[PDB]
Design a protein around this ligand. Structure first.
Ligand SMILES: Nc1nc2c(ncn2[C@@H]2O[C@H](COP(=O)(O)OP(=O)(O)O)[C@@H](O)[C@H]2O)c(=O)[nH]1
Ligand SMILES: Nc1nc2c(ncn2[C@@H]2O[C@H](COP(=O)(O)OP(=O)(O)O)[C@@H](O)[C@H]2O)c(=O)[nH]1
Lengths: 366, 366
């Protein structure tokens, strides 16, 4: 059977899609199922995963690189900065990962060039909207004007992976075989161009359907049987203390400080700037779930350990839970998560979580 | 029961999505079912429908205006030129149609302003790629840079319809009980930004999933029962002599001339320039159907009367059909349509077609 997982952010980004994406890749991989890891969009966000004691903040290479048997795809609907990809390939190779012979880079992706970074960095974008100024918008604007170059136009990408129009081969594997495709989305619903905060937003929308359009794969490409087995899943990742990037980046409900929360300060991957942080806003998450398509949503509550420090690093509830004060605290927070009947996981650290369902059992049962 | 129809082009545009869209609106309306007519994207193409002896080439107003009971939506994922919309409202009102009290214009749509038209018209776009230079790309570029204004920023739009964030009201109507939503796509698969002809292409992709993303409605928002009733349909419209816009607009297989084909020359709605015309290319249509998602595709063969002049204006096959030489010509052409088991209709004129299935019977039954 085939499956499509799309991992998306329910707030303004940095909800831990990297962690959840890798968890999904390893779900299929550890069960011996063929699996592919695809990244879409552009390098204006890093997705953090841990493996064997190392922390990887990836902007371009799919986080499925951690699993040796996973094919890695950079979708047609991407912007690819070759200096970023070169650095990430060099980085993982220096830790013994092998990626070049299983990395597929679509030739129709936009080539994000130095001039795109320069154009954003010298513009009013950061001052006006808090942009990372990493060139993604400038590249997309050039693509719209049909003056951008494509990945297929730069032979240097062939040193890093296979530059090939793989989309129909991939669709065929889903239709005609048994492939699990994990699509790593970026940022979060509330940053979407049309989600309500414009102009304090990013240059695309950030729903599952946007990332599927970028991937060039349709959920209805799956067979009736595979859809009936719940083969199409949208993983909406949320955190209890929503963040935004530093600066003039838009409204943040209940904005507070890392110190007031008793939490270590967090910094953005692509700029190292301190994140803004606020209190949980269920209305944003409600709108995100509705926009993504509630019938296929599974909700992942990341950083439950920031709400309940006693959970840090655990993969099961601690012994004295029923008798503790913080059992009610967690239950009360869960009560006000919209659509909480779809909650499937509690994140407890950068590489740990409490799984609410017997995912491996249900795989074996199909 | 609810339903979503998305009407798309299988080639380079002007396949007759206007005609097919109106046919879909009237299918629901003539059966007394609640129906909504939505347009997405921008006014770089006209969709031609006929009603009561008049020809309407619509760039902005949904063609469902022809049916008095149909709500009309301009989606969030749109570019709206107010001069175009004003002229089209004025035009239909002069023929007795009433639209202003049933027209809903999303405030998050981009406001396409005169400066966007001027920027394209004075640029190299038309010379380089055959662009209509109607400002859609320049407006999308400003939206990407977060410098565009929105429909919600111009009170003048409120003179023409209701400016309201209707998306969740619309989604609720679909989820909770019998609405048919007809989404009028534009252009055609082969013009897509990532479909393979870049830079001789338009500034977006043109698949069903792109138009659904613009609409803000997901096919999987439909209930299990409604999907099981085939509630989600992608109508891929093709013509036997594919066209392109005039000029340096890209490769056109088997390019010929209107005189060589024995057909009246056709002109584009938005520029009045003469269309280029070629011979049917099955590979393009195969790629279009695959990209749209074959499992939900119904194929409409428009302009069958250009292939078989004896069909012009007919709603049924002519009397002597079995004995004619035309039967073989039509049969052979259908044989080489990709996925021709999904053929549902033969267009025979600007407002006539031969339906291959008993659509009204199916509606009453299922
Ligand atoms: N304390 C805690 N940290 C997490 C958890 N999950 C992920 N992290 C981390 O918190 C962060 C989220 O940032 P980021 O990875 O950029 O999110 P992404 O962009 O959505 O993938 C990273 O530093 C992660 O390593 C969790 O469950 N608990
Ligand atoms: N001869 C013939 N013309 C059709 C048919 N269907 C539509 N037309 C017309 O052919 C054309 C297609 O152009 P257009 O409406 O712009 O296509 P659209 O952009 O896809 O909606 C228009 O002039 C239509 O009125 C058909 O079945 N036979």
């Amino acid at each position: 059977g085939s499956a499509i997982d799309v991992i998306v952010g329910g707030q303004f980004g940095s909800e831990a899609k990297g962690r959840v994406t890798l968890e999904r890749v390893q779900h299929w991989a550890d069960n011996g199922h063929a699996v592919a890891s695809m990244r879409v969009a552009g390098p204006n966000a890093g997705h953090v995963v841990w493996d064997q004691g190392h922390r990887f903040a990836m902007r371009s290479l799919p986080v499925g690189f951690v699993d040796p048997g996973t094919d890695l795809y950079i979708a047609a609907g991407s912007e690819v900065d070759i200096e970023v990809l070169q650095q990430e390939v060099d980085l993982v190779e220096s830790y013994g990962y092998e990626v070049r012979d299983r990395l597929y880079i679509h030739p129709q992706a936009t080539w994000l060039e130095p001039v795109h970074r320069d154009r954003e960095a010298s513009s009013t974008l950061t001052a006006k909207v808090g942009s990372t100024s990493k060139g993604i918008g400038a590249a997309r604007s050039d693509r719209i004007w049909r003056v951008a170059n494509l990945v297929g136009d730069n032979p240097a990408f062939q040193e890093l992976g296979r530059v090939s129009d793989f989309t129909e081969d991939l669709r065929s594997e889903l239709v005609d075989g048994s492939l699990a495709l994990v699509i790593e989305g970026t940022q979060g619903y509330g940053l979407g161009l049309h989600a309500g905060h414009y102009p304090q937003c990013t240059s695309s929308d950030a729903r599952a359907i946007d990332f599927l359009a970028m991937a060039g794969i349709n959920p209805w490409d799956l067979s009736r049987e595979d859809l009936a087995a719940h083969g199409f899943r949208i993983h909406v990742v949320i955190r209890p203390f929503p963040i935004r990037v530093a600066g003039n980046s838009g409204e943040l409900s209940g904005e507070t400080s890392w110190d007031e929360l008793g939490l270590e300060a967090e910094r953005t991957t692509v700029t190292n700037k301190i994140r803004r942080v606020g209190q949980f806003d269920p209305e944003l998450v409600r709108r995100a779930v509705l926009a993504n398509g509630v019938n296929n949503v599974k909700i992942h509550l990341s950083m439950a350990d920031q709400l309940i420090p006693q959970l840090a690093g655990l993969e099961d509830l601690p012994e004295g839970w029923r008798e503790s004060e913080y059992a009610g605290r967690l239950r009360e927070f869960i009560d006000q998560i919209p659509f909480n009947e779809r909650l499937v996981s509690l994140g407890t650290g950068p590489h740990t979580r409490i799984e609410l369902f017997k995912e491996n059992l249900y795989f074996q049962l199909e």
